[PDB]
Write an enzyme that holds these catalytic residues in place. Structure first.
Site, PDB file in Angstrom:
ATOM      1  N   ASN A   1      10.201  11.249  -3.339  1.00  0.00           N
ATOM      2  CA  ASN A   1      11.067  12.290  -3.952  1.00  0.00           C
ATOM      3  C   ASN A   1      10.218  13.107  -4.947  1.00  0.00           C
ATOM      4  O   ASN A   1       9.183  12.610  -5.449  1.00  0.00           O
ATOM      5  CB  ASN A   1      12.327  11.677  -4.593  1.00  0.00           C
ATOM      6  CG  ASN A   1      13.116  10.748  -3.687  1.00  0.00           C
ATOM      7  OD1 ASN A   1      13.468   9.635  -4.086  1.00  0.00           O
ATOM      8  ND2 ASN A   1      13.404  11.179  -2.466  1.00  0.00           N
TER       9      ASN A   1
ATOM     10  N   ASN B   1      16.697   4.579  -2.967  1.00  0.00           N
ATOM     11  CA  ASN B   1      15.815   5.215  -3.970  1.00  0.00           C
ATOM     12  C   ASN B   1      15.338   4.138  -4.957  1.00  0.00           C
ATOM     13  O   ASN B   1      16.180   3.362  -5.421  1.00  0.00           O
ATOM     14  CB  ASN B   1      16.585   6.371  -4.639  1.00  0.00           C
ATOM     15  CG  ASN B   1      15.686   7.396  -5.288  1.00  0.00           C
ATOM     16  OD1 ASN B   1      14.506   7.148  -5.440  1.00  0.00           O
ATOM     17  ND2 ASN B   1      16.222   8.551  -5.662  1.00  0.00           N
TER      18      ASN B   1
ATOM     19  N   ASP C   1      10.726  13.564  -8.018  1.00  0.00           N
ATOM     20  CA  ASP C   1      10.705  12.924  -9.364  1.00  0.00           C
ATOM     21  C   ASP C   1       9.684  11.777  -9.394  1.00  0.00           C
ATOM     22  O   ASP C   1       9.618  11.100 -10.447  1.00  0.00           O
ATOM     23  CB  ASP C   1      12.109  12.461  -9.762  1.00  0.00           C
ATOM     24  CG  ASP C   1      12.665  11.287  -8.967  1.00  0.00           C
ATOM     25  OD1 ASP C   1      12.030  10.865  -7.988  1.00  0.00           O
ATOM     26  OD2 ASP C   1      13.728  10.794  -9.352  1.00  0.00           O
TER      27      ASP C   1
ATOM     28  N   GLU D   1      19.075  10.007   7.534  1.00  0.00           N
ATOM     29  CA  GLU D   1      18.181   9.465   6.468  1.00  0.00           C
ATOM     30  C   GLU D   1      16.867   8.979   7.100  1.00  0.00           C
ATOM     31  O   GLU D   1      15.797   9.280   6.538  1.00  0.00           O
ATOM     32  CB  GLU D   1      18.873   8.344   5.684  1.00  0.00           C
ATOM     33  CG  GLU D   1      20.015   8.823   4.799  1.00  0.00           C
ATOM     34  CD  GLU D   1      19.640   9.735   3.632  1.00  0.00           C
ATOM     35  OE1 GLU D   1      18.437   9.997   3.451  1.00  0.00           O
ATOM     36  OE2 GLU D   1      20.544  10.183   2.914  1.00  0.00           O
TER      37      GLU D   1
ATOM     38  N   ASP E   1      12.155   6.747  -1.447  1.00  0.00           N
ATOM     39  CA  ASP E   1      13.323   6.313  -0.639  1.00  0.00           C
ATOM     40  C   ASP E   1      12.806   5.404   0.483  1.00  0.00           C
ATOM     41  O   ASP E   1      11.811   5.773   1.142  1.00  0.00           O
ATOM     42  CB  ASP E   1      14.068   7.521  -0.065  1.00  0.00           C
ATOM     43  CG  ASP E   1      14.871   8.343  -1.067  1.00  0.00           C
ATOM     44  OD1 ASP E   1      14.969   7.949  -2.256  1.00  0.00           O
ATOM     45  OD2 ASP E   1      15.426   9.374  -0.632  1.00  0.00           O
TER      46      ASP E   1
ATOM     47  N   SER F   1       9.927   9.034  -7.535  1.00  0.00           N
ATOM     48  CA  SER F   1      10.593   7.878  -6.914  1.00  0.00           C
ATOM     49  C   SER F   1      10.344   7.968  -5.397  1.00  0.00           C
ATOM     50  O   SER F   1       9.866   9.025  -4.898  1.00  0.00           O
ATOM     51  CB  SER F   1      12.054   7.813  -7.263  1.00  0.00           C
ATOM     52  OG  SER F   1      12.746   8.922  -6.702  1.00  0.00           O
TER      53      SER F   1
END
Ligand code: NA
Length: 129
Positions: A46, A59, A48, A35, A52, A50
């Protein structure tokens, strides 16, 4: 902060992540490796819109507030910036809520695709825990 592998393994264990919801420490260390590469300051946008945040790339769509994710929740009740701290307490507390949400560590697509079913104990090899 860029954690050492064994340094992060000790920190996660101290915060009670070792075998949390049945997931051994090496699963958590493996997830953090793929990650964040063990970097608390890691951020990734991301598709969309959003973002992280932190060692476990939590998220803003569901878990933390960053003020720029329309229609999102803050189910860990924290600013996303708190997930970038050298102190992993907020990341761990929030990760305990995520992994309890019903799909276990499949919530971390990098865990599902890169850690699940592998020799995850390798990630705590040599560590004094
Ligand atoms: Na949010």
């Amino acid at each position: 902060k860029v954690f050492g592998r064994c340094e992060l393994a000790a920190a996660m264990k101290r915060h009670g992540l070792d075998n949390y919801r049945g997931y051994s420490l090496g699963n958590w260390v493996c997830a953090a490796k793929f990650e964040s590469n063990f970097n608390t300051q890691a951020t990734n946008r991301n598709t969309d819109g959003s973002t992280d945040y932190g060692i476990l790339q939590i998220n803003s769509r569901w878990w933390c507030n960053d003020g720029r994710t329309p229609g999102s929740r803050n189910l860990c009740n924290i600013p996303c910036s708190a997930l970038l701290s050298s102190d992993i307490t907020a990341s761990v507390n929030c990760a305990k809520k995520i992994v309890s949400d019903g799909n276990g560590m499949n919530a971390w697509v990098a865990w599902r695709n890169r850690c699940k079913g592998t020799d995850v104990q390798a990630w705590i090899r040599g560590c004094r825990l």
